[PDB]
Amino acid sequence: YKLICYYTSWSQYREGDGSCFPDAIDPFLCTHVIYSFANISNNEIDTWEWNDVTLYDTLNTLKNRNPNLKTLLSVGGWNYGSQRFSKIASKTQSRRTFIKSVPPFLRTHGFDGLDLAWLWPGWRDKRHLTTLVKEMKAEFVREAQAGTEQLLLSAAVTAGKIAIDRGYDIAQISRHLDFISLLTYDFHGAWRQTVGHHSPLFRGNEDASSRFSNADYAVSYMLRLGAPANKLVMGIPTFGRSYTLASSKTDVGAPISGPGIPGRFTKWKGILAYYEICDFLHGATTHRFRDQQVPYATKGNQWVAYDDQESVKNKARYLKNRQLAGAMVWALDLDDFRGTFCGQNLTFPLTSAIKDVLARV
């Protein structure tokens, strides 16, 4: 079973103990470590940060410790216009320039493949997303001829039913892709003027407002659309989402005034790291959606839907039974990487719990 772990390039700026570089990463933790993010310019893969070349090197040296670890580089992400990506993929010469540009860049910096983080294609874009993956793969196949082991090509897919339908032809891209990472942690939109869990496993017996907002639906649907199990990786959040309550009402359907306050380290409204969360838990009221098997916390006018070791193992169990390829972790820098915030002296608590589960019978 593959354990695919993402690392973010900006994690480095976070203040104090939030500062995370790639040298903090335990080399036998994951199987595939992906580095976000990579930019495009002059229609070809380029770096984002001012010192990615150093960081790439720091990552791809961890491979000296674990000769078997594989490392990919992801392209795009959100801080990067769909319109931009779309512009490149929709034309035959810009799509070819960019493609032609990857293998050498990737080989220069030690990466073993490319992850396509197109934070999402429109419906006019679906056709080119297929053409882009198809042609991209063909290039990795033609450079394999030159000695070095073939470059892995993976894609990052959203788990929202409308989104999949809009810009992804699953049956077609699953052939050309080495694995698909399904983003099962964005199941609770902004508009929702209430609390709710973003990465629930099951529906929720309370009042199905759209039988589709959970990992289980999303998984069935991909396997239904034709993505083989041996190619699916379920996405597991290592972070939580906070919201500021609009009343003292704290359970299902509770009203919401807007996102929760910024964390001390992550400094972003509406989101918290697991290390920031273990700290928040102190003097909080914890609960659990029996139905959806995921926890949430609450203190003051702050309510959080998050993922703990039990929930994360429970997901890691589910996907084994489903016989999927493995799990994907949205982010390493957001797990308790120093292992100094969550009680037990264990670094990467959350990602370790899974790893353990992937090796059980």
Ligand SMILES: *[C@@H]1O[C@H](CO)[C@@H](O)[C@H](O)[C@H]1NC(C)=O
């Ligand atoms: C990446 O590409 C865009 C357009 O190619 C360029 O204008 C911009 O400076 C780059 N963005 C970053 C964050 O490097």
Ligand SMILES: CC(=O)Oc1ccccc1C(=O)O
């Ligand atoms: C999604 C993720 O990686 O966490 C964040 C989300 C929004 C803004 C900042 C961060 C962060 O990395 O600190």
